[PDB]
C-alpha cells in the first residue's frame, strides 16, 4: 500500500519542511501536462493552437519552469496584509491632506501640469493592468503566473488612486475638465504618443517570453521612471506633496515587480541561449521606450535632464540582471 | 475480437464487452451476462437471452454470428429477456 507523506508528493525530498508559499503556489497549471493537447478537448480548437504557439513554442526555454520562486514569496494571504497596510497609509494621506485643503494650495500652473501629465495616466496604468493580466494567463508555470497575478492587482491599484484623485481635482477645479479630458490627451498629445505606441504594440506581443520582456523589462521601467520618479520629483518641488508621496508609495510596488522579473531573468540565464534571446527582445523594444521617455519628459520643466535620468535609470534595471 | 457496448436489461449501466467475430448471438449474450447477472441483475432461467441492435430495435436470431451482423466497432446492443 501507499504510505502517508510528510508533504505534497511533488515536494517530497526537499530537505526543508516546505513553506506556505511552496505549499499553495506550486506546480499548479495543468495545460502543461500534454504539450500536444493542452486542454481536455479537440486539439485543433483555436485555444490549443494559442497555447502551443505562445507558451510551449517560446524561444525562451527551460527544462522545469515550475522550479521558479518569488523573492517576495507572495500569497494571497500575505498580499492582502501587505497592501491593506499600504492602503491605510495612502487612504490616510488622502483623508488628511484633504482635511487640510492641500489641493487649494497648488498653483494654477501646477494644476495645468496635473491635467496634462498626471490624470491621463489612468489609461496607461490600465493598459499595464491588461499587460500583466495577459502575462498571467500565458506564463508556463503557476509560481510565475502568481507573480503576474499580484502585479496586476497593483496595476489596478494605481489606476484606482489615479481615478480617485481625479474627482478630487475636478472637485477642487471644475473649469479644468479633469475626468472629461484625459482620453483626448492620451489620444492626441505629443507627450503621450511616445508611450501609447509603446504600450499598444507591446500589448499584442503574444509569446509569453516576449510579453514578459516587452511589459516587465522594457515598458514598466520606462513608465515607472517617467510617471512616478520624474513627475514625483517635480510634484514635490512644485508644492504638490501628495503626488510626491503618492508616487513614492506606488514605486514600492514597482520595485517588487522588478524583484521578481529580476529573479526570473536570473533563472532564465541558467540555460544557454536565453541571454541572447532576451537581449534580442530588449533591442527590439528599447527604441520604443526611448521614444516614450523622450516624448513625455521633454514637455516637462527641465525636460532635457528628466530625459537623461529616466533613460539611464530604466536601463540600470536591466544592466543589473545582465 | 470486437468491442461492443452492452445494454443489459434491468441493469443501470452500459458496459464495454469484448466479443469474438465468430460468436453466436447466444455467446455474445453469455459474455454480457458475465458482467450483469449476479452482479446487478437477478438471473431468469424461465427466460432466454436475446440480442437487439440498440439504435433501431433490430432483433438478431440466436445463432447468427457477429461477423454477419454487420456491426460497427463499439456498437451498442440491448441484451434482453424473452422465450
Amino acid at each position: 500500500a501507499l504510505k502517508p507523506l510528510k508533504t505534497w508528493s511533488h515536494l517530497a525530498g526537499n530537505r526543508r519542511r516546505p513553506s506556505e508559499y511552496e505549499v499553495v503556489s506550486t506546480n499548479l497549471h495543468y495545460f502543461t501536462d500534454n504539450p500536444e493537447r493542452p486542454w481536455e478537448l479537440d486539439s485543433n480548437l483555436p485555444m490549443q493552437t494559442w497555447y502551443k504557439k505562445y507558451c510551449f513554442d517560446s524561444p525562451l526555454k527551460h527544462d522545469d519552469w515550475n522550479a521558479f520562486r518569488d523573492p517576495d514569496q507572495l500569497v494571497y494571504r500575505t498580499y492582502n496584509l501587505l497592501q491593506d497596510g499600504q492602503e491605510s497609509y495612502v487612504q490616510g494621506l488622502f483623508d488628511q491632506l484633504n482635511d487640510r485643503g492641500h489641493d487649494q494650495m497648488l498653483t494654477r500652473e501646477w494644476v495645468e501640469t496635473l491635467a496634462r501629465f498626471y490624470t491621463p495616466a489612468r489609461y496607461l496604468f490600465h493598459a499595464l493592468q491588461m499587460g500583466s493580466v495577459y502575462i498571467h494567463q500565458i506564463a508556463p508555470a503557476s509560481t510565475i503566473t502568481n507573480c503576474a497575478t499580484y502585479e496586476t492587482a497593483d496595476h489596478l491599484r494605481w489606476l484606482t488612486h489615479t481615478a480617485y484623485r481625479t474627482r478630487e481635482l475636478a472637485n477642487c477645479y471644475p473649469d479644468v475638465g479633469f475626468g472629461k479630458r484625459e482620453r483626448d490627451v492620451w489620444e492626441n498629445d505629443p507627450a503621450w504618443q511616445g508611450f501609447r505606441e509603446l504600450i499598444e504594440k507591446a500589448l499584442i506581443a503574444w509569446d509569453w517570453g516576449e510579453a514578459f520582456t516587452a511589459i516587465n523589462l522594457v515598458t514598466k521601467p520606462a513608465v515607472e521612471e517617467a510617471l512616478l520618479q520624474q513627475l514625483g520629483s517635480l510634484a514635490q518641488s512644485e508644492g504638490d506633496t501628495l503626488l510626491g508621496l503618492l508616487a513614492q508609495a506606488q514605486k514600492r510596488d514597482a520595485e517588487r515587480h522588478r524583484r521578481w522579473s529580476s529573479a526570473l531573468v536570473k533563472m532564465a540565464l541558467e540555460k544557454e541561449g536565453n541571454r541572447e534571446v532576451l537581449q534580442k527582445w530588449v533591442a527590439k523594444w528599447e527604441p520604443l521606450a526611448d521614444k516614450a521617455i523622450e516624448a513625455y519628459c521633454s514637455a516637462l520643466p527641465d525636460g532635457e535632464n528628466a530625459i537623461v535620468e529616466a533613460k539611464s535609470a530604466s536601463r540600470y534595471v536591466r544592466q543589473m540582471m545582465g | 475480437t470486437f468491442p461492443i457496448m452492452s445494454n443489459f436489461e434491468r441493469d443501470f449501466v452500459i458496459q464495454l464487452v469484448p466479443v469474438d467475430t465468430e460468436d453466436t448471438m447466444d455467446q455474445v449474450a453469455e459474455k454480457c451476462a458475465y458482467h450483469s447477472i449476479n452482479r446487478r441483475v437477478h438471473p431468469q432461467p424461465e427466460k432466454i437471452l436475446r440480442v437487439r441492435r440498440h439504435e433501431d430495435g433490430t432483433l438478431f436470431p440466436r445463432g447468427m454470428i457477429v461477423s454477419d451482423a454487420g456491426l460497427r466497432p463499439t456498437e451498442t446492443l440491448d441484451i434482453i429477456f424473452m422465450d
Binding site: 500500500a1 504510505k3 506546480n27 492602503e87 | 443501470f12
Partner: protein, 491 residues
C-alpha cells in the same frame, strides 16, 4: 475628508480608448474577446450591479482570511477529521481533489476577461475575480495540507487534476470547455452566469450547512468564507447577456446558456447528487438532492432567464424528469467502480436509508433498489468479488461520465449514439449529444478513457493497466466508506 464611492467610481472603469498604432482587432482578437461585431461603445453600457474598489477589496479580504485561518489554527490540535463520519471524510477528499486546482485555473479564466473584454467594467471585476480564484485555489490547498500525514488520499487535493483518473478528466472536460478555451464574453456567460450564479453559489451554501451539521467547523468556515466572494465575480455574466440580447444575438446568447447549464448539471449530478442522498448520514439530511435542486437551483434559473428576456432551454422537461434518476446512476457507478476513485464511497443503502430513499423518490426500490439487492445478497453470501468490476463502463463522449439511467422494474437506460466522419460516439443523454452536434469542431478528436483503452493507448490493456494509467495505487484506491458495516443489518 474622504469621497463617497458613488462620486468617483465610474472613472475606475473609464479606461477604453481608440487604438492607433495597432488595430482594434489586433488589440482585441475576436477568438479571445468575442465582441461579436458589437461595437466598443455598445459594450461600454455594461454595468455590473455589485461594485468594489481596491482599498475596499484588500481590506475586507484581509479580514476574511484572518478569520478562516484563525479558526483552522484553533481547531487544528483537536483533530476532528479523525473521528468524523467516514462518509464525511470522503466528501472532503472528493471536494478538494475536484476543485482546488480548477479553482486555481479559474483565475486564468477570470484573467481572460480581464484582458480581452471590451466592457471596461468587466475588465476590472475580472481582476478582482482573478484575486478571488487565486485565494480559492490557494486556501483549498493549505487546508487539506494539514491531513497529508493521515492518508495519501489527501495528496489528491494537489495531484488529482494532474492524473487521468476518470473523474478528473470528467472535471477538465467541463472546466476547459466552459472557461479555459472560450472567448472573454463567452466565459462570462458560461462560467460566471451559468455555473457560478447557477450552481456553485447555492451548492457552496448547502455544503457549509452540511459541514456544520456534521460538526466540522473548520470546513464549515472554509466553505462559507469562499462563498462570501462568489457574487462579486459571479455577477459578470448577466450584463453580458443583456448587451447580447438587446443587441442582435439572443440566439447565440441562448445557445451558450443552453450548453453551459447542461454541462454543469451533469458535473453536478455526480459530485453533489451522490453526496447529498448517500454520504451524509440519514438524520443529517434536510432535503433530497431533488428537493434541493428544485428549491434552490431550478426556480432561479427560470427567474434569471425570464428577466434577461431569454427562454427556458429546449431540454428543460427532460432535465426535470432526470432529477429522479441521473444521480442515483452516477452513485451506483462510482460505488460499484469504487477503486477507480480516490475517496471511499459510501454505499447508502441500509434499511432506514432505503426507506428515506423511497420516500424522497417513489419507485426507487423497484428500480435502483433491485441492483443493490443483488449487491447486498452477495456480501451477505460471502461473495464480495461480484461487487467490484471486470470491465469499463461506457463513457459518455461529451461529459466523460458513465452512461447510466433507470434499472429494475422500469428499465430505461439509453445510448444516444452518433456516427460522425467514420467514428462512432457514445452519449449519455440527448442534450449531451446535441452539445457535440452544434459544435463538433471542438470535440471531434478528443478521446475518452474507453476510446483510449480501445485504441491501445493503455498498456497493459487490462484492469491493472488502466489503474496505473489513472495513477491509482492501493492506499489511495477507494473502497466502501463504512467498511461494509451497513451489511450486518442483513446478516
Amino acid at each position: 475628508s474622504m469621497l463617497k464611492r458613488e462620486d468617483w467610481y465610474d472613472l475606475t472603469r473609464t479606461t477604453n480608448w481608440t487604438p492607433k498604432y495597432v488595430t482594434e482587432n489586433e488589440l482585441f482578437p475576436e477568438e479571445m474577446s468575442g465582441a461579436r461585431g458589437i461595437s466598443m461603445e455598445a459594450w461600454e453600457k455594461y454595468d455590473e450591479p455589485y461594485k468594489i474598489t481596491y482599498p475596499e477589496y484588500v481590506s475586507i479580504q484581509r479580514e476574511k482570511d484572518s478569520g478562516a485561518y484563525s479558526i483552522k489554527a484553533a481547531l487544528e490540535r483537536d483533530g476532528f477529521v479523525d473521528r468524523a463520519d467516514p462518509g464525511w471524510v470522503s466528501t472532503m477528499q472528493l471536494h478538494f481533489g475536484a476543485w482546488a486546482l480548477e479553482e486555481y485555473a479559474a483565475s486564468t479564466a477570470e484573467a481572460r476577461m480581464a484582458r480581452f473584454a471590451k466592457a471596461p467594467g468587466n475588465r476590472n471585476m475580472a481582476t478582482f475575480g482573478m484575486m478571488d480564484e487565486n485565494r480559492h485555489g490557494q486556501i483549498q490547498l493549505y487546508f487539506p495540507y494539514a491531513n497529508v500525514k493521515r492518508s495519501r488520499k489527501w495528496d489528491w487535493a494537489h495531484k488529482a487534476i494532474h492524473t487521468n483518473e476518470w473523474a478528473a478528466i470528467a472535471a477538465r472536460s467541463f472546466f476547459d470547455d466552459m472557461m479555459m478555451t472560450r472567448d472573454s464574453v463567452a466565459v462570462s456567460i458560461m462560467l460566471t452566469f451559468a455555473f457560478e450564479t447557477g450552481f456553485s453559489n447555492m451548492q457552496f451554501l448547502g455544503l457549509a450547512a452540511d459541514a456544520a451539521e456534521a460538526g466540522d467547523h473548520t470546513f464549515a468556515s472554509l466553505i462559507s468564507s469562499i462563498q462570501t466572494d462568489e457574487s462579486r465575480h459571479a455577477q459578470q455574466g448577466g450584463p453580458s447577456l443583456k448587451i447580447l440580447v438587446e443587441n442582435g444575438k439572443k440566439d447565440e446568447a441562448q445557445q451558450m446558456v443552453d450548453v453551459a447549464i447542461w454541462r454543469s448539471w451533469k458535473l453536478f449530478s455526480v459530485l453533489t447528487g451522490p453526496i447529498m442522498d448517500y454520504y451524509t448520514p440519514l438524520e443529517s439530511r434536510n432535503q433530497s438532492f431533488k428537493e434541493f435542486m428544485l428549491e434552490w437551483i431550478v426556480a432561479q434559473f427560470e427567474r434569471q432567464l425570464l428577466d434577461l428576456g431569454l427562454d427556458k432551454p429546449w431540454y428543460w422537461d427532460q432535465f426535470m424528469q432526470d432529477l429522479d434518476e441521473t444521480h442515483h446512476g452516477m452513485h451506483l457507478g462510482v460505488w460499484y467502480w469504487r477503486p477507480t476513485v480516490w475517496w471511499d464511497p459510501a454505499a447508502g443503502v441500509s434499511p432506514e436509508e432505503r426507506e428515506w430513499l423511497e420516500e424522497k423518490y417513489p419507485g426507487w426500490n423497484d428500480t435502483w433498489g433491485q441492483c443493490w439487492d443483488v449487491i447486498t445478497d452477495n456480501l451477505v453470501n460471502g461473495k464480495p468479488e461480484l461487487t467490484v468490476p471486470e470491465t469499463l463502463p461506457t463513457i459518455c463522449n461529451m461529459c466523460n461520465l458513465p452512461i447510466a439511467h433507470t434499472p429494475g422494474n422500469k428499465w430505461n437506460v439509453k445510448d444516444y449514439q452518433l456516427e460522425y466522419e467514420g467514428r462512432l460516439y457514445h452519449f449519455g443523454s440527448e442534450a449531451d449529444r446535441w452539445c457535440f452536434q452544434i459544435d463538433p469542431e471542438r470535440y471531434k478528436n478528443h478521446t475518452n478513457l474507453v476510446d483510449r483503452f480501445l485504441k491501445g493507448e493503455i498498456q497493459p490493456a487490462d484492469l491493472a493497466g488502466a489503474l496505473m494509467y489513472m495513477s491509482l495505487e492501493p492506499g489511495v484506491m477507494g473502497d466502501d466508506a463504512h467498511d461494509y458495516e451497513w451489511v450486518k443489518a442483513y446478516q
